[PDB]
Amino acid sequence: SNATRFERNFLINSLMFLETILSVDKKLDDAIHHFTQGNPRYQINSRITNADDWSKEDKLKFTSAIAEAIALVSEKYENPTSETTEQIQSARNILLDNYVPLLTANTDPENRLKSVRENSSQIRKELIAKLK
């Protein structure tokens, strides 16, 4: 159970940054991007559910926000052991491989990123409830 706690905390913090980035305007999103700029290639596009129903702009907003979220969470761990780098790699792989399909599912075409925001808030609340 504690073997999964690293990835669960990583997810909670990543979702917090995801929701924050999706909650502010384009200028702030570009400022956040600029701050995390320089760059890992996470292949987030391929994990979006029903990606052919997503506009290019929505995909760009989402993938940028995820990559920025991973950057922001990952930089909290200064001087990591091999175990921490592998832990980050797995928690990030869980975010990308397990949660991006969840976060991008059942979104409302009127405003898909608002749906992502709400999917994220619910998932994060559930995980937090079972950590506390």
Side-chain angles (χ1 to χ4, degrees), residues 1-4 6-26 28-38 40 42-59 61-88 90-124 126-129 131:
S1 175
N2 304 354
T4 59
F6 187 80
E7 54 97 351
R8 276 180 284 118
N9 241 269
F10 190 93
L11 291 168
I12 288 166
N13 290 328
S14 295
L15 296 182
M16 147 201 92
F17 280 121
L18 177 62
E19 290 160 45
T20 299
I21 296 167
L22 297 178
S23 293
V24 301
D25 61 29
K26 175 193 201 67
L28 283 182
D29 284 352
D30 293 341
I32 296 168
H33 188 71
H34 176 48
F35 173 78
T36 60
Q37 170 92 9
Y42 293 130
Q43 312 172 314
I44 301 157
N45 267 347
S46 66
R47 297 156 161 79
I48 294 178
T49 297
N50 294 327
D52 297 335
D53 293 318
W54 282 61
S55 68
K56 169 179 91 162
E57 290 295 309
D58 280 350
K59 291 186 203 183
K61 284 192 185 77
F62 173 76
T63 63
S64 291
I66 288 288
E68 288 149 19
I70 295 167
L72 290 166
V73 172
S74 298
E75 70 188 14
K76 179 178 176 177
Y77 305 94
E78 343 231 80
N79 299 294
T81 66
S82 291
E83 293 63 32
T84 294
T85 68
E86 285 148 13
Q87 223 149 2
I88 290 173
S90 220
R92 175 181 70 233
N93 289 339
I94 288 168
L95 177 60
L96 297 169
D97 299 353
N98 287 256
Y99 278 83
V100 165
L102 285 175
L103 293 164
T104 59
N106 299 311
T107 62
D108 179 354
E110 181 72 42
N111 191 338
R112 296 201 189 279
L113 278 306
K114 182 181 296 188
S115 293
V116 172
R117 198 162 79 208
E118 290 159 354
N119 291 342
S120 183
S121 64
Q122 284 284 286
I123 294 168
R124 171 174 59 80
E126 292 154 12
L127 281 175
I128 289 171
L131 279 179

